[PDB]
Structure 1
Amino acid sequence: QIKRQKMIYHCKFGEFGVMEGQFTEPSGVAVNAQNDIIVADTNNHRIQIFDKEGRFKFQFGECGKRDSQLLYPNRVAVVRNSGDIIVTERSPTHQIQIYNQYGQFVRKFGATILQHPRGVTVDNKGRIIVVECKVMRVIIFDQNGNVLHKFGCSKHLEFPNGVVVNDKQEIFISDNRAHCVKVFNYEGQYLRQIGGEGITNYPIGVGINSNGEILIADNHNNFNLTIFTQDGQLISALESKVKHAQCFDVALMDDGSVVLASKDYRLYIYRYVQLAPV
């Protein structure tokens, strides 16, 4: 029922492979303060960092369980102020790893606590928030590995696959099978719903931009971006001109863009802002 603004990507990079700028599986994507694009390249067991234009800068990590090694890294997040890179690993490892902006290993934790990490983010106080699929848990860490909060949401979540937070201790979780974003507080109380069936079907990720606006991305037919206020009011809706392979994850860039990681081993950058027409 919504007439969506058409959009095309202005940037595309990546391909299959093990060399620099190549992926085996780009399961996770994140963006730092300088709009560098950080990608979890799972089956290469490494993290790759690109600039905002998709040029390879550097990589870190290799297959293993030792320090400075990764085993199936799937999601990434950035500590804004320090530029530290938060990495989650999939089961059987299911733990958090922290690397600094130079790709040096800092620490790892949460291995005995996490089961199926599926989304990760960091609030303005540096607390690390992980959402887990299947078991439907949310776990909040500090950067040294202490558990600050923990709660289940198996009552409200069917398939959680993305998470962000505002500065009011509200957690926005995209739910693939509920066709919407679910909002919680740090205590674990369900607050409200953003989007829903018919406008945000099968969401694959969620973002919060510098305006505090909530972006919900999905690939239900074309690639769609639906933008809301935190109270749930729709303010913008976009749709891609071409169809995309399965989408793993999305991240926001300060220029008003979404970085899209897809199963065709490529990343796409869509602009969701435009000039005001005369």
Structure 2
Amino acid sequence: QIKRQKMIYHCKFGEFGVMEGQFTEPSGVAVNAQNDIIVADTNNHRIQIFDKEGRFKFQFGECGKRDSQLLYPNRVAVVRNSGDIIVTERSPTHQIQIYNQYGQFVRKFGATILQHPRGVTVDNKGRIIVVECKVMRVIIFDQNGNVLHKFGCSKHLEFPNGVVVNDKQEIFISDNRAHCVKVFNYEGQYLRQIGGEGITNYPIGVGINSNGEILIADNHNNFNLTIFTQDGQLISALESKVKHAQCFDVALMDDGSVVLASKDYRLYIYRYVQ
């Protein structure tokens, strides 16, 4: 058994509700280049943007099925070099909507292709990667909504709930029921495993930081954060002080921090390096 440094959060915001700064269901969280916190407020049909200190900035998306209208947004990603926000809509829309940094509509696509989007992210070539649970599929789009890659992996995925990529076309997916992160390439080849049972049980998300370290997040008792090299060599392991409710999503921030979206309708900002 491995020894974990203790970690605590230094910021916390949000509460149940329907007004600014309030959440019905904070299903997805993403961080942009100025470390704003973008939240998918699913049952409120809106995306909410805060600064790195939980301060509400603005919001966009009203109920509906046409342009400039979100129904059930569950996950978000950010195009870092543009500020654009990538939104995935749950059933019955099952599609992707792209908004700019100002919350204005750009385009939407993928409704005839997506079914169960459970994680989304963007690579350095601007390509959008989506992972789907229940059916176990990875689909990769360009910014214009053209499908570039599609592959199933029901043989290798039990419960995919998060995704990031590096600069080498490798895809890192957290598998909640495999208790690890599984690595694939864009062609669908199953490369390797990072983490495992006993060290990263029931992961709830995965991240990659500026050092190119793979962070696996779980909530199997405390809120645990296990940090690996891209090979799977263990670097660092941490556990929180508090115990949390169910957790939706995690997102990394510039200065060695993680945003943790909880069932208790509050986002918690942990720091994993002093």
* Alignment TM-score > 0.5, same fold: yes
Pairing of 1:233-252 with structure 2 (within 5 A): 233-252=233-252
Cα deviation, residue 63, structure 1:
1.2
Q: What is the aligned partner in structure 2 of residue 226 from structure 1?
A: 226
Spell out, residue by residue over 1:128-152, the C-alpha distance to the aligned partner (whole angstroms, 9 max, x if none). Answer: 0000001100000001100000001
* Shift, 1:111, TM fit: 0.3
- 1:272 deviates by 0.2
Shift of 1:62: 1.2
1:101 maps to which residue? 101
Q: Supply the distance in 2 between the matched residues of 1:8 and 1:252 (Cα, whole angstroms).
A: 15
Q: How does 1:243-262 map to 2 (within 5 A)?
A: 243-262=243-262
CA shift at 1:244, angstroms?
A: 0.2
TM-score by length of 2: 1.00
Distance in 1, Cα, partners of 2:189 & 2:25: 34
Structure 1, residues 227-257: CA drift from partner, whole Å, max 9, x if none? 0000000000000011000000000000100
Per the TM alignment, residue 270 of structure 1 is displaced from its structure 2 partner at its CA by: 0.3
The CA deviation at 1:171 is 0.1
Q: Taking structure 1 as the reference length, what is the TM-score of the superposition?
A: 0.98
Q: CA deviation at 1:2?
A: 1.1
Secondary structure at the counterpart of residue 106 of structure 1: strand
* 1:84-233 alignment, distance < 5 Å: 84-233=84-233
| Equivalent position SS for 1:43 | helix
What is the SS of the residue equivalent to 2:94?
coil
CA distance in 2, matches of 1:247, 1:143: 29
Shift of 1:91: 1.2
Give a deviation string over 1:139-192, Cα, whole Å, max 9, x none. Answer: 000011000000011110000000000000000000000000000000000000
RMSD between superposed Cα atoms in Å: 0.4
List structure 1 segments (4+ residues) > 6 angstroms apart after TM superposition.
Answer: none
Per-residue CA distance 1:6-46 (angstroms, 9 max, x = gap) = 01100000000011100000000000000000000001010
Q: Note the C-alpha offset of 1:49.
A: 0.3
State the Cα deviation string for residues 36-85 of structure 1 (Å, max 9, x = none).
Answer: 00000001010000001110000000111011111110000000000000
CA distance in 2 between partners of 1:58 and 1:160 (Å): 31
Aligned-residue offset at 1:3? 1.1
Partner of 2:6: 6
Q: Distance in 2 between matches of 1:146 and 1:57?
A: 32
Which sections of structure 1, spanning at least 5 residues, go unmatched?
none
The residue correspondences of 1:48-59 to structure 2 (distance < 5 A) are 48-59=48-59
Paired residues, number: 274
Q: Provide the secondary structure at the position in 1 that maps to 2:63.
A: coil
Deviation (angstroms), 1:267:
0.2
Q: Write out per-residue CA displacement over residues 111-137 of structure 1, whole angstroms, 9 at most, x where no aligned residue.
A: 000000000000000000000001100
